[PDB]
Amino acid sequence: ENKNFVISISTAEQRRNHIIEQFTHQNIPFEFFDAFTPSDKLTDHLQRYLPNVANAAQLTMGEKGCLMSHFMLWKKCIDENLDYITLFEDDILLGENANKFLAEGDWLKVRFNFQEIFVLRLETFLMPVQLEKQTQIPPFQQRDIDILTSKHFGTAGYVISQGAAKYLIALFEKLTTEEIKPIDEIMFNQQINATDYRVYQLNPAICVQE
């Protein structure tokens, strides 16, 4: 049964073509998941599963769509009782030998207990954006006063266990409107060190976002 899903807007024809070309070339089975966009489908799904996220001003409707797409794929994993599911965004470039990781699950089956709670990053480890410049407050002694953020950690390529699929559905359903952040900031920053939640990194990575 199919484990590799590529999150793609249904009308993103060129991106879908570049994905099909690369996956076909390395004989890696996959399906598209039709990414949520500003729509009634997104609005109703947010209301059905994440009304806490529907009310969150601090997320753009694009960021809300991204989170809903990943969420529904965590649901699919539970519903089909898959051991794991592997999720990509449609702007990824596969490395040579990605098929050694992405065609077969045996290397996962001999390393992992799928009831345990883990994510394995397949995408390159990304340094967050941290210093934003601002003009409101003037510099002093030729040093700037920047704003601190931690943004864009990347959700474009990871394996998630059934255990972590359950864990993350519950987490995003649990969080108050004030606690909501973009999916990447929770999955790959805030929840790191949490009790029983492990994130692994394939080094070197087997794909990267364009």
Add this chain to the structure above:
Amino acid sequence: ENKNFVISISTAEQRRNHIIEQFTHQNIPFEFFDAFTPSDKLTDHLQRYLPNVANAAQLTMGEKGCLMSHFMLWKKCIDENLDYITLFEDDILLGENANKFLAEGDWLKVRFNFQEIFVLRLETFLMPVQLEKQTQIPPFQQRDIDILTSKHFGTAGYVISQGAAKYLIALFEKLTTEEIKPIDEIMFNQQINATDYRVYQLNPAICVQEL
């Protein structure tokens, strides 16, 4: 009134001497704040102000002491109705012209509303998440499987407004035992994009920790 406080365990002689040497050299006024240690004083303070933190297994008594030291200095700021207070740990190294930032507060008074909620980091910013090597899960196709960790953002050098002193006392009093993390993980990671809470970074920084 003195605005610069260096959090230091009273018995850390060499650290206190390195602090005194650097602050004297640049003519920067400061006082030591006697850091909380595993003691009855820490236990009672945790019970008095942060009973949520007293119960938190996921913090070491050292991390709980660090948080209590910062908390009591936020309290001092409110109680004395200071516009701001500047907090250091005793393992800090001052850069060349730190005294141009740390001797006087005028450059702060002409830039900031002290009732607004801001922290200005004086200390260098380091990466939130790092790759650790691990042995539990074996490599495949000669690629490692590293684990993501985050341990130290640094609370060794920041200016806090009275607004942010109120905000952070409330926050640490509010959080459930389950929600408690080390002070640095909340102040400079989890709270970053929060509604009224701004963290500024002096770039380039004017100090750095030895840690």
